[PDB]
């Protein structure tokens, strides 16, 4: 329903910048715009989250239950 | 010289450059600094010291340390009929369980009580996890930016029994403290992957079965210390996994020292050919403490006829065996020993510890 | 009788828009 607290592979407290990272990407998108057209690697770097795959792939793909309800 | 060589504690923080991040920063949470607590890569140089100590290491600092973590008390998820249909007791106690705490008080009961008087859909943020138990938090034990459950409009949630749970990772995920992010043979010479011929190959050029590193490079992450304190912080824990380690060898040493004495632990066979069979049995054990064993007493009696360990995924136990050309006393005597070896290398693991951070 | 509209959903919606406003208390 949300980001996970933890990334799920590694345990990596991806939620502590999960809400931020929300709202950044959001105002990325704002600036770019039918799926994807962003690269999100600087957003993500930003926040300190590592070169990770487990981390950046649960971060940026897990869907938002307020989203979509 | 030295075993445990320089460390470089590196923190990971909020890079505020970026426009976007600051904004959002800013805009929910009224952030402009770094926050209380922050994960932190160590990457740590060991030299002289067998590939085995150095991964044993490594996994009691990944699960096999105690840990803490924030659990509700049973009954303390207020059913009510008011409370949020969608956030049920499963969803938000497994959202807190995963909340990394720096706690070094266990005393420590959070409540959680939010209500959505509005019409939009309130999130309830790690923010909102306020504290009545004992000791007033003079540090923060978790960052306030955790995203827990949002509330529907007109509904709420009230968790009033939210405290502090110690165990290790390897039970419970949610005790995990160390994540890995670097490990590397430093005497192992490495060939260029990115070249055609060897992307298909580790990249070590001596094979993982006849070769013996002696000098490691280990990365660990933990997720959460207080920003002030890290140094302190990263020294309890490597010293704290280094304390582990040596407790669960002296447990073995004990059944060791008690050979003659029944028990169904350690069993001793004088099978043929003066060779006695020795099988040390010990339940819920690991890998680091057998493979610990296997390599040190293989280094004690580079001579002996088999040392081998096995824990099985069931049955939940490491079974240890070694049979050698000795009489049972002077085998358990050469095990004795052994373990003695391991004890002396992680006391000075625990030193350099001191000796290093600071 | 109350069973047939407690079960009712717009009482439901009825009711979740009168604890947004404050008019029943959060509770049941
Ligand atoms: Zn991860």
Redesign the interface.
């Given at each position: 329903?949300?980001?996970?607290?933890?990334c799920f592979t590694?345990?990596?407290?991806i939620?502590?910048?999960?809400?931020?990272?929300?709202?950044?990407?959001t105002?990325?998108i704002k600036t770019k715009m039918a799926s994807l057209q962003i690269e999100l690697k600087?957003?993500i770097?930003?926040?300190?989250?590592?070169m990770?795959v487990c981390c950046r792939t649960h971060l940026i793909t897990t869907l938002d239950?307020?989203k979509y309800? | 010289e030295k075993i445990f060589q320089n460390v470089e504690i590196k923190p990971?923080?909020?890079?505020?450059?970026?426009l976007?991040?600051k904004?959002?920063?800013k805009?929910?949470?009224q952030?402009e600094e770094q926050?209380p607590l922050?994960?932190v890569?160590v990457v740590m140089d060991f030299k002289g010291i067998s590939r085995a100590a150095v991964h044993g290491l490594s996994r009691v600092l990944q699960d096999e340390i105690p840990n803490y973590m924030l659990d509700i008390k049973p009954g303390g998820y207020k059913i009510?009929?008011?409370t949020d249909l969608?956030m049920t007791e499963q969803?938000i106690r497994?959202?807190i369980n995963?909340?990394?705490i720096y706690a070094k008080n266990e005393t420590l009961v959070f409540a959680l009580r939010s209500?959505?008087?509005?019409?939009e859909?309130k999130?309830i943020?790690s923010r909102d996890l306020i504290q009545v138990a004992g000791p007033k938090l003079k540090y923060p034990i978790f960052?306030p930016?955790?995203?827990i459950?949002?509330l529907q409009?007109?509904?709420?949630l009230i968790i009033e029994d939210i405290y502090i749970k110690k165990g290790i990772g390897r039970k419970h995920?949610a005790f995990?403290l160390a994540?890995?992010?670097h490990f590397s043979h430093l005497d192992i010479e490495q060939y260029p992957t990115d070249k055609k011929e060897y992307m298909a190959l580790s990249g070590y050029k001596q094979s993982s079965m006849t070769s013996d590193p002696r000098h490691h490079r280990l990365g660990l992450?933990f997720?959460?210390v207080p920003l002030p304190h890290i140094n302190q912080a990263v020294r309890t824990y490597l010293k704290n996994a280094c304390r582990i380690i040596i407790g669960r060898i002296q447990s073995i040493q004990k059944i060791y020292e008690n050979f003659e004495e029944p028990q169904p632990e350690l069993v001793l066979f004088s099978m043929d050919e003066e060779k006695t069979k020795a099988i040390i049995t010990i339940k819920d054990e690991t890998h680091t403490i057998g493979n610990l064993l296997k390599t040190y007493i293989y280094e004690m009696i580079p001579d002996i006829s088999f040392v081998g360990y096995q824990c099985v995924p069931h049955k939940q136990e490491m079974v240890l065996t070694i049979i050698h050309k000795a009489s049972q006393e002077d085998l358990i005597t050469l095990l004795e020993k052994s373990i003695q070896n391991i004890i002396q290398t992680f006391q000075i693991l625990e030193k350099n510890v001191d000796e290093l951070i600071a | 009788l109350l069973t047939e509209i407690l079960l009712d959903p717009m009482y439901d919606y009825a009711?979740?828009?009168a604890?947004?406003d404050?008019s029943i208390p959060?509770?049941?």
């Open positions: 329903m949300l980001i996970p607290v933890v590694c345990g990596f407290p939620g502590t910048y999960a809400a931020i990272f929300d709202k950044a990407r105002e990325y600087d957003l770097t930003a926040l300190g989250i590592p990770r239950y307020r309800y | 990971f923080l909020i890079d505020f450059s970026n976007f991040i904004n959002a920063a805009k929910l949470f952030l926050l922050v994960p890569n009510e009929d008011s969608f969803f497994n959202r995963f909340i990394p209500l959505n008087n509005s019409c859909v999130t943020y960052n930016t955790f995203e459950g949002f409009p007109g509904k709420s995920a995990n994540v890995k992010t992450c997720p959460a | 009711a979740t828009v604890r947004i404050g959060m509770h049941k």
